[PDB]
Ligand binder design. Sequence first.
Ligand SMILES: O[C@@H]1[C@@H](O)[C@H](O[C@@H]2CO[C@@H](O)[C@H](O)[C@H]2O)OC[C@H]1O
Ligand SMILES: [Ca+2]
Ligand code: NA
Length: 131
Amino acid sequence: SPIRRDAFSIIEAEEYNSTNSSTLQVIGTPNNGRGIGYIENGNTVTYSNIDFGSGATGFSATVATEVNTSIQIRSDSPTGTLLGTLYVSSTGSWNTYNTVSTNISKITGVHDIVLVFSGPVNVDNFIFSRS
Ligand SMILES: O[C@@H]1[C@@H](O)[C@H](O[C@@H]2CO[C@@H](O)[C@H](O)[C@H]2O)OC[C@H]1O
Ligand SMILES: [Ca+2]
Ligand code: NA
């Protein structure tokens, strides 16, 4: 998985750098893309050295789930700053992907990003939006 990445270009969820999970798998999507799934509550997934440049204040992810769930976006580590929380309600199937967005606190410069999962969701990709 890449050692660094730009916040303002698509980041593939399957190209993560570390996770605490023992269940998480790289999955296929309907259009022969990939994602992450078999995620459980408490699972964290880290993406190294994301460059936010002069500032991001939003987060968008393309996700699929059949249960209402939430994903914290943290900077630096699992106990680092809570940037925001993406609340995801059921998209209707594990294979029906929806872009969902939330606000975050303005973050600048280079930081690891940790996604923290409250439950099962399939994640294809994500991207940040500038301030
Ligand atoms: O059709 C398959 C999906 O069902 C699968 O998504 C998984 C469904 O079971 C859930 O408990 C898991 O959390 C979730 O990832 O992904 C692969 C796809 O081919
Ligand atoms: Ca993907
Ligand atoms: Na393990």
